[PDB]
Every structure is written in C-alpha cells, then in structure tokens.
C-alpha cells in the first residue's frame, strides 16, 4: 500500500529519528529496507506506523523500554485486530496493561473494565489503560493532517 | 545509628550490587563513604535502606529509571515523613503516582483515593499505587529477618 520514509514516519508519529533507528536496531519494528546508498532505502508501511504509534504511547505511560517492547510483541501476536484495519475504531476494545514481578511473564494484558481495574488499584497493582480506538484515531488524524 | 555494608544492603533490600553501584554513580542514593582501600568503605544508613526499598519497588511497577529517580526525589523532598520514622506504619498515607507528558513536570504524586484513582483510569491515565506502609513494613521485616 502506502509507504513512508523515516523522516515522514518520524513526523507523522512524533517519534524522533533517533528513536526509530534504535527501535530498528533492536528489532522492535522491521521496516522494509534495501541495499545502502545515497537514496532512500528504509520504508514504513501503515501497519509499521501503527506500531510506532503504539510504542510512543506505551513509552508515554512511563513504562520502561523492555516492557514497552514486550507489550508491543504481545499486542501484535495476541491482539492482531489492533493492526488489521478490520475493526472500525468504534468497535475496537480498550485494554489495560498490568506489569508483574515475574521475569517469565512480566506483563499481563486484559480487556479494560472499571470494576476489575479499580479492584487491581485497591490491591496495590499498577494499571496502564490502553485505548485501542485512540491509537487508531491518532494515527488516522496525524495522517489526514500529514497530507495538509 | 545502624550502618550496613553494600552486600548487607543488597541482601536486605533485594537490590543487586550492580544496581547499588549504578544508583551511587548516578546520585540516586548517597551512602557514606571514605577513601578507597582493601577494607569496607561504603556504608548505608537505615534511611538509605528505605530509599533502596522505594527504588526497588518503583522499578517493579515497570516505571522507567528516570521517572523512578524523579519519584524518589519528589518523595524525599515532598513526603519526608516517609523517611522520618515519625509516623507509625498504621498512620502512614498511601499514595499514587501519575506519569504525565510534561518534561518539566513528568510525574504527579497524590494521596491515594479510590474515587479519584478510578476516575483517572476511566480517563485513560496510568495509575501507580504506592503503599507507604508496605514499604516501611517490608524493610522492617527484611531487617528483623536479617539478624536471623
Ligand atoms: N502498591 C505497592 N506499594 C508498595 N509495595 C508494594 C505494592 N504492591 C506490592 N508491594 C510489595 O511487593 C512485594 C510483592 O507483592 P505481591 O503481593 O505481588 O507478592 P507477595 O505477596 O510477596 O507474593 P507471595 O504470595 O509469593 O508471597 C511485597 O513485599 C509487597 O509489600
Ligand atoms: N490510555 C490511552 N491510550 C491510548 N492513547 C492515549 C491514552 N491516553 C492518552 N492518549 C493519547 O495521548 C495524547 C495526549 O493525550 P491527553 O488527553 O493527555 O492530551 P491532549 O488531549 O492531546 O492535550 P491538549 O488538551 O493539549 O490537546 C492524545 O493523542 C491521546 O489520544
């Protein structure tokens, strides 16, 4: 479909070029590449831009990088409807991330619901709301703006 | 009062020696030191052990290091009763940390209350409960255990 350069991706998703390069180096995001040269050689898909938008949003919660990476991996594997363009934003489900003390399973991801979320807080557990619709709305609005 | 070596501090608070060295290097915690030599030369106070316990607990929430450091600085300045041994644990107030998107003020700290905390979650805001009493209880129990 539509492909975007690194500077275009950086400006659309409000990730710095330095962040994109680091996330490429670490395998967080895998844009399409070709041999090195003076011309453009790295291109992000719309799904990559969505992954960038997720990563920037997770990092804005204060969550450490390793857990943001783990969250993005879990979202892409377990919640692929987030990246599908199948579900219109009105029907996407809001989620919540619950960090744990288990190195093997360091992050729980669940559907958001107020009763369970408030119960977790009253037990002393950190809750990180993750509004799937806002994610997709934010990229869509950055992109509609991007042309103009 | 009582002073503890780095290995004693590491084992009491379940921070690795590598973490203590890094937090010393960065100024997170400032144990008492003297000139270098073959003998012991770094000593943690009970208040330092409390600061270590806070730092290990904040890092367990998933909060990134810079914000844990900022949280510890804000707690020591704004909530010195946490480190005073004034308030018995039964009267210490539970808190909550709310990470923000402002670089100048990247973290809000507030008294915990369920109504406000649930309202923040429903608005999409991350909430990190911080149980002051559990902090002081945990070190006290690690220390009562430590002798035996
Ligand atoms: N919100 C909080 N603020 C401060 N300390 C906390 C908070 N939540 C948990 N802790 C501390 O984290 C440690 C582990 O807590 P948690 O209840 O998850 O496990 P635990 O009860 O030690 O596990 P186990 O059931 O295996 O003994 C405990 O020492 C607890 O005091
Ligand atoms: N829980 C969440 N999940 C996903 N995206 C979120 C969540 N909370 C906030 N955002 C996104 O973070 C960005 C900033 O949110 P916030 O409401 O704090 O500020 P804002 O409304 O952009 O600020 P202003 O009032 O200055 O325009 C928004 O794009 C919003 O969509």
Author numbering:
A (entry chain A), B (entry chain A): 3 to 150
Paper text:
Here we characterize the MerR-type transcriptional regulator Alr3614 that is encoded by one of the CAST (AnCAST) system genes in the genome of cyanobacterium Anabaena sp. PCC 7120. Alr3614/CvkR is translated from leaderless mRNA and represses the AnCAST core modules cas12k and tnsB directly, and indirectly the abundance of the tracr-CRISPR RNA. We identify a widely conserved CvkR binding motif 5’-AnnACATnATGTnnT-3’. CvkR repressors are at the core of a widely conserved regulatory mechanism that controls type V-K CAST systems.
To investigate CvkR functionality at the structural level, a high-quality crystal structure was determined at 1.6 Å resolution. CvkR consists of a classical winged helix-turn-helix (wHTH) DNA-binding domain at the N-terminus (residues 1-80), a dimerization domain (residues 81-132), and a potential effector-binding helix in the C-terminal region (helix α7, residues 133-150), in which an ATP, used as reagent for optimal crystal formation, was bound as a ligand. By dynamic light scattering (DLS), a ~5.1 nm (~51 Å) average diameter was measured for CvkR, consistent with its assembly into a homodimer of ~54 Å in the solved crystal structure and the result of our SEC analysis. Three antiparallel β-strands (β2-β1-β3) and one short α-helix (α6), together with the equivalent β-strands and helix of the other subunit, comprise the bulk of the dimerization interface. The contacts are predominantly hydrophobic and bury 997.6 Å2 surface area (PDBePISA)47, which is much smaller than that observed in canonical MerR-type proteins, for instance, 1896.8 Å2 in CueR. In comparison, the mode of CvkR dimerization significantly differs from MerR-type regulators such as CueR39 or MtaN48, which assemble into homodimers via two-helix antiparallel coiled-coil (α5/α5’), and is also distinct from the unusual MerR-type TnrA/GlnR family regulators, which form homodimers relying on an N-terminal extra helix (e-α1/e-α1’). Therefore, the pattern of CvkR dimerization is unique among the MerR family members. In our solved structure, the crystal optimizing reagent ATP was bound near the putative effector binding site through π–π stacking, cation–π, and several hydrogen bonds. While the nonspecific hydrogen bonds at the N1 and N6 positions of the adenine moiety, together with the unbound triphosphate group in the putative effector binding site, suggest that ATP is not the natural effector of CvkR, other nucleoside derivatives might be possible candidates. However, subsequent EMSA experiments showed no effects on CvkR DNA binding when such ligands were added, indicating that ATP and its analogs are indeed not the natural effectors of CvkR.
